[PDB]
Amino acid sequence: PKMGYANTLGQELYVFEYEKDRDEGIDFEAHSYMLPYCTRPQLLVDVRSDAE
């Protein structure tokens, strides 16, 4: 959600470097807007070593 990034293809990581005021140091920001998913979850079988 920064200026110039609206309605654009997102990427894995957004790295932003900002200089502090006067001369006090460096500011950093890292962003990630992601969600993994599976379209056939019925194939995600889990196994157990005990009896039913």
Add this chain to the structure above:
Amino acid sequence: ISLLDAVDRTSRKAETSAPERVRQISFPMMYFKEVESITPDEIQGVRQPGTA
């Protein structure tokens, strides 16, 4: 200016004229300011009216 007044030829009398008058004035002025802003929330995922 005024209107001349008749006088005698031997009394030698006459009439004079008054001076002018000068003044000074000042003027203050008017000030108007307008402010605006642009934010990515106005562009992100918003349909253009009249378009599908």
